[PDB]
Amino acid sequence: STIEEQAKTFLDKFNHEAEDLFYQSSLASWNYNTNITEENVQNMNNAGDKWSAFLKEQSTLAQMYPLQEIQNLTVKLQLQALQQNGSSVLSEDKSKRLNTILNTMSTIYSTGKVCNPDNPQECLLLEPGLNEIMANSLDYNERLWAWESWRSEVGKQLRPLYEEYVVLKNEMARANHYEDYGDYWRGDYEVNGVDGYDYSRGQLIEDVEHTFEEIKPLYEHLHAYVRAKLMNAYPSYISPIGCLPAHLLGDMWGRFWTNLYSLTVPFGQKPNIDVTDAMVDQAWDAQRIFKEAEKFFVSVGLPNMTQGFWENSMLTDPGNVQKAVCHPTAWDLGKGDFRILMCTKVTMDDFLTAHHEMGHIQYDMAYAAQPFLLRNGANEGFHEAVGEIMSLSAATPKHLKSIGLLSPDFQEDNETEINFLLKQALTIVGTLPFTYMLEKWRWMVFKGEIPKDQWMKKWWEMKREIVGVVEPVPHDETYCDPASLFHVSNDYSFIRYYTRTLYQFQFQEALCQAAKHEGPLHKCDISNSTEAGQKLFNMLRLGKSEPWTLALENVVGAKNMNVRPLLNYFEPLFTWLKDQNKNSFVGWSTDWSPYAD
Ligand SMILES: CC(C)C[C@H](N[C@@H](Cc1cncn1Cc1cc(Cl)cc(Cl)c1)C(=O)O)C(=O)O
Ligand SMILES: *[C@@H]1O[C@H](CO)[C@@H](O)[C@H](O)[C@H]1NC(C)=O
Ligand SMILES: *[C@H]1O[C@H](CO)[C@@H](O)[C@H](O)[C@H]1NC(C)=O
Numbered sequence: 001s002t003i004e005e006q007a008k009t010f011l012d013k014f015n016h017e018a019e020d021l022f023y024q025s026s027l028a029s030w031n032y033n034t035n036i037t038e039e040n041v042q043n044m045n046n047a048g049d050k051w052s053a054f055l056k057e058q059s060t061l062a063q064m065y066p067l068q069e070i071q072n073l074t075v076k077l078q079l080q081a082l083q084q085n086g087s088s089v090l091s092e093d094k095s096k097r098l099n100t101i102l103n104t105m106s107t108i109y110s111t112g113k114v115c116n117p118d119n120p121q122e123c124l125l126l127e128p129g130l131n132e133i134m135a136n137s138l139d140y141n142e143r144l145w146a147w148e149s150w151r152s153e154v155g156k157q158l159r160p161l162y163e164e165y166v167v168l169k170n171e172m173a174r175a176n177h178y179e180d181y182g183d184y185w186r187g188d189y190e191v192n193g194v195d196g197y198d199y200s201r202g203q204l205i206e207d208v209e210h211t212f213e214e215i216k217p218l219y220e221h222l223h224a225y226v227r228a229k230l231m232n233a234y235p236s237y238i239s240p241i242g243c244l245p246a247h248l249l250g251d252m253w254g255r256f257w258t259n260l261y262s263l264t265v266p267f268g269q270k271p272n273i274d275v276t277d278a279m280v281d282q283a284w285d286a287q288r289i290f291k292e293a294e295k296f297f298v299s300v301g302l303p304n305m306t307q308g309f310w311e312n313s314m315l316t317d318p319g320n321v322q323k324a325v326c327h328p329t330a331w332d333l334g335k336g337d338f339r340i341l342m343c344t345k346v347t348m349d350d351f352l353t354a355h356h357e358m359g360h361i362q363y364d365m366a367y368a369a370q371p372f373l374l375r376n377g378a379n380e381g382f383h384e385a386v387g388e389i390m391s392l393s394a395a396t397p398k399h400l401k402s403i404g405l406l407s408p409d410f411q412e413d414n415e416t417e418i419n420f421l422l423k424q425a426l427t428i429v430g431t432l433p434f435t436y437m438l439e440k441w442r443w444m445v446f447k448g449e450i451p452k453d454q455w456m457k458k459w460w461e462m463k464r465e466i467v468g469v470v471e472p473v474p475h476d477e478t479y480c481d482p483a484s485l486f487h488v489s490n491d492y493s494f495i496r497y498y499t500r501t502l503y504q505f506q507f508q509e510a511l512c513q514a515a516k517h518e519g520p521l522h523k524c525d526i527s528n529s530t531e532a533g534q535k536l537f538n539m540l541r542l543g544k545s546e547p548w549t550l551a552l553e554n555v556v557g558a559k560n561m562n563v564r565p566l567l568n569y570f571e572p573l574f575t576w577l578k579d580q581n582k583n584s585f586v587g588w589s590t591d592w593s594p595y596a597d
């Protein structure tokens with residue numbers, strides 16, 4: 001029989017052992033992220049250590065098939081993955097150290113503690129505490145300790161191992177036909193096979209570059225507007241001309257300025273559109289949330305969460321007695337097993353993140369029925385970009401209103417608009433420059449453009465030009481600030497958040513028009529419309545068996561990342577920021593300082 005047949009099986013003989021062999025790891029791997037005992041650690045790095053050996057072995061027993069000599073395009077690209085020597089390319093008993101490094105980094109993060117100065121016994125984990133503070137405290141000082149202490153106490157520990165991490169990981173990358181590890185994560189976005197749809201790795205970069213320009217204006221005015229209302233509540237601390245201090249951003253990293261809402265609300269007297277409060281005066285809990293969320297997908301086609309999910313997902317920190325990584329994550333253990341690990345809180349933040357995490361799931365399912373080594377979203381952007389297509393709709397006063405956290409509200413005042421839209425900006429635009437800059441530095445390093453002795457160097461120089469933010473305390477190259485933001489210390493590429501942000505609005509400008517909407521998309525409902533659910537559905541199911549470029553094209557006109565639908569969402573808020581800012585200065589100083597004073 002044909003040779004494009006010794007594989008059409010070799011693959012399927014693979015999709016069946018792997019799934020279980022995987023699930024064997026995902027399951028143990030889960031006992032860890034849910035209880036950082038240690039007994040659980042080993043069990044875990046034993047389950048994947050074999051899957052390691054499994055995949056490794058099946059890599060050689062795979063490349064036994066020549067490149068082409070294969071049709072049915074799928075069968076070929078599916079082959080692609082396997083042929084690539086995994087991180088096995090490493091010195092067997094070397095990659096071990098990587099894990100040793102990887103595992104720690106994780107624990108350090110979800111376990112590290114800073115302890116109150118005036119009471120060696122009042123220690124705070126990052127969740128919550130360093131977190132609740134960096135999200136609520138208004139005491140420039142409380143804010144300040146938390147910020148520094150975290151980076152100081154834990155951050156510093158990370159350093160040593162991060163230095164080893166880039167190295168080890170790099171060697172693995174480059175010894176795999178890539179320029180570095182970054183070139184690797186840029187891989188995800190790559191597509192070859194198809195012509196006119198081919199997308200290169202070096203592209204993803206300059207494609208973010210370009211798309212970033214049209215994003216700057218809207219940022220600056222948004223940044224120069226919140227340097228204002230931020231001075232208004234921390235006078236004598238921030239210059240009306242030089243990037244705000246890192247600890248007043250609304251959260252440990254300033255990744256999201258969504259908590260600077262009460263300090264920046266444009267018309268703070270209209271009905272708060274941060275139903276974080278209405279939720280408490282209704283006693284909303286974890287379930288109720290993930291139930292009110294699951295209720296959304298079901299309104300637009302997509303199924304209800306499986307009873308298996310409801311019986312294993314950890315939707316609240318088990319508190320003292322068992323320590324689990326609290327970062328919200330949507331798990332796929334395969335074999336039909338779907339779970340979500342999130343230390344849910346009754347915030348409006350956790351209301352949306354639920355719509356996120358869930359979205360991950362609704363996707364993981366939507367492409368379940370698909371060759372195992374192919375079920376995986378067109379690309380990271382897409383996976384991230386999905387739950388955000390919901391939060392976009394399920395956060396509009398409209399929805400929020402009808403849902404409950406906003407009984408019969410003041411019509412929709414031409415002002416509740418700039419009001420609602422400023423929050424979004426806070427969350428969505430706030431992150432773009434932060435999201436970008438971090439990955440850039442992340443690339444620069446793997447690349448090489450930043451020698452070990454210049455890490456915290458470029459990092460803050462950068463945080464200054466691009467993000468438009470400065471550090472409250474000179475950080476020596478003893479630190480490692482960009483290793484105290486989960487994502488970093490636990491692998492996870494970061495640029496999917498950038499890309500996800502732009503995909504987000506393209507998919508939305510299409511579905512509204514696929515539910516017959518007739519206003520700006522920042523008024524677009526999308527709930528109850530199967531016309532919409534359906535469309536998106538026919539998209540999710542294809543897994544990663546179709547270049548995202550084509551997939552994108554088949555869903556929303558363009559076959560690539562478009563910044564304009566976003567610029568359209570925030571056009572109302574922009575022109576207004578224009579006004580409000582008329583007197584205030586748009587831009588910032590890359591030489592200022594809140595301490596050099
Ligand atoms: C790739 C995964 C390992 C991490 C990621 N989780 C989210 C979690 C998230 C969504 N929106 C906000 N956050 C941050 C966060 C929320 C909560 Cl309730 C607790 C904590 Cl510790 C962090 C992210 O960091 O983007 C994701 O699902 O894409
Ligand atoms: C797997 O690794 C071996 C030795 O490092 C190498 O010869 C082989 O080409 C790799 N797999 C492929 C087909 O790239
Ligand atoms: C092409 O051949 C493969 C393996 O023989 C088969 O499973 C697949 O269904 C065919 N094309 C598709 C993707 O339907």
Ligand SMILES: [Cl-]
Pocket residue numbers: 253481482
């Ligand atoms: Cl930082």
Ligand SMILES: [Zn+2]
Pocket residue numbers: 356357360383384
């Ligand atoms: Zn996500």
